[PDB]
Design a binder for these strands. Structure first.
Ligand code: MN
Ligand code: MN
Ligand code: NA
Ligand code: NA
Length: 327
DNA sequence: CATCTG
DNA sequence: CAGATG
C-alpha cells in the first residue's frame, strides 16, 4: 500500500502505455497482474530477483525493477513521457467519444490537439463532437449543491409523467460525496419486469420530458434501456450559466431495481465485502439479483427483494445507510 | 453490457 | 456483422 508503491506505479504507467499506444494487450495485461501481485506483497522489494520470485513476475519486469530500484527512474519510462506521439494519445483520449483506437488514427493523420480536432470536426462523429464541444465542462467535477438541484428537477418531472415511476440517483451522490462526476439515474416502473416484454416508451417518455423542459440538452446514445446524455441547470438570472453535465438514465424491470440500486451505489469495496459476506450467509449477489446458494457446487433462484433492506436482511446484515457504504 | 458506426 | 466507446 506504500511499501511497494513506485514499483506498482511505474508498472502501471508501463502497462497503460502498452495497451493505449502500442496495442500490446498481452504486455499491457502483463504489467497489471504484476503490479497486482507486488501490491499484495507484504515486504519491501529490495531487488528484482526478489521480485521475480513472484508469480506474474518475469525476467523483463524484474529487469525493470532493478533499474528503477537502482536509480530513481526508468529509461523507457523517460523516453515515453517525452514522446509526443504517446502524449497525444493520452490527450485525445480525453475526449468523450475518443478511445485509443481513434486516438491512434487521428494522430496518424496529424490531429494531435484540440484545435486539430475543431478544424477537423468533420472526421468526428456525433458523440465525439459533443465531447469536443464540452471538453471543458466535461472535466469539471459536479458539486453536491448542483447535484441536489438536478436531482430535484429530474424527480419532479419523472413524477409528472407517471406517478408510478421510481427514480434513484445512485452514484456517490447517493453515498454522501461532496461532488460527483456524472449524474446516474436508476429507473423502473411497476409495469416493467424480468418477464414483461418490454415497453421502450417507459424510458422515452421521460427522456422527452427532460428535454421538454430543457434539462436534457443533447443525446449521446439512446437505446431502449439506456440513455447517455447531456444536461443543464437553467441559467438563472443571466450572468452565471452552468457547465454542461454528463447524464445517464437507465430503465430496469421493477423486479431487480434494488439489486441494481444497491449495486450502482457502491463503493466497489462496499460491494465486494457485501458479496463476500453474502456468500458466507449462503448467497450470491450480482447487479440484478440475490440467490440462495445450493451446496452441489452452486445453484440459484431469484430471491424476492422490495428494497435494499430485503437484501441485507437476507445476508442477515446491518442495514447500511448509504453514507456508510464506504467500505 | 448496450449502443453506434460503417 | 465486428469493433469501438462508455
Ligand atoms: Mn457517477
Ligand atoms: Mn456513469
Ligand atoms: Na475519451
Ligand atoms: Na478477431
Amino acid at each position: 500500500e506504500t511499501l511497494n508503491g513506485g514499483i506498482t506505479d511505474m508498472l502501471t504507467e508501463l502497462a497503460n502505455f502498452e495497451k493505449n499506444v502500442s496495442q500490446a494487450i498481452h504486455k499491457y495485461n502483463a504489467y497489471r497482474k504484476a503490479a497486482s501481485v507486488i501490491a499484495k506483497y507484504p515486504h519491501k522489494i529490495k531487488s528484482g530477483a526478489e521480485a521475480k520470485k513472484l508469480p506474474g513476475v518475469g525476467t523483463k519486469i524484474a529487469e525493470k525493477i532493478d533499474e528503477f530500484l537502482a536509480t530513481g527512474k526508468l529509461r523507457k519510462l523517460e523516453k515515453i513521457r517525452q514522446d509526443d506521439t504517446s502524449s497525444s494519445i493520452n490527450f485525445l483520449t480525453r475526449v468523450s467519444g475518443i478511445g485509443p483506437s481513434a486516438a491512434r488514427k487521428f494522430v496518424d493523420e496529424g490531429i494531435k490537439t484540440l484545435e486539430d480536432l475543431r478544424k477537423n470536426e468533420d472526421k468526428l462523429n456525433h458523440h465525439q463532437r459533443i465531447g469536443l464541444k464540452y471538453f471543458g465542462d466535461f472535466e469539471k467535477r459536479i458539486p453536491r449543491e448542483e447535484m441536489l438541484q438536478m436531482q430535484d428537477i429530474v424527480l419532479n418531472e419523472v413524477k409528472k409523467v407517471d406517478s408510478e415511476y421510481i427514480a434513484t440517483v445512485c452514484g456517490s451522490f447517493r453515498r454522501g460525496a461532496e461532488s460527483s462526476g456524472d449524474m446516474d439515474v436508476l429507473l423502473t416502473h411497476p409495469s416493467f419486469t424480468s418477464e414483461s416484454t418490454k415497453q421502450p416508451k417507459l424510458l422515452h417518455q421521460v427522456v422527452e420530458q427532460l428535454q421538454k423542459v430543457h434539462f436534457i440538452t443533447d443525446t449521446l446514445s439512446k437505446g431502449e434501456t439506456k440513455f447517455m446524455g447531456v444536461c443543464q441547470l437553467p441559467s438563472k438570472n443571466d450572468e452565471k450559466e452552468y457547465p454542461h453535465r454528463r447524464i445517464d438514465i437507465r430503465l430496469i424491470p421493477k423486479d431487480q431495481y434494488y439489486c441494481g440500486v444497491l449495486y450502482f451505489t457502491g463503493s466497489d469495496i462496499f460491494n465486494k465485502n457485501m458479496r463476500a459476506h453474502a456468500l458466507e450467509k449462503g448467497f450470491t449477489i450480482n447487479e440484478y439479483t440475490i440467490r440462495p446458494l445450493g451446496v452441489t457446487g452452486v445453484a440459484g433462484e431469484p430471491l424476492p427483494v422490495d428494497s435494499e433492506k430485503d437484501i441485507f436482511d437476507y445476508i442477515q446484515w446491518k442495514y447500511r445507510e448509504p453514507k456508510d457504504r464506504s467500505e
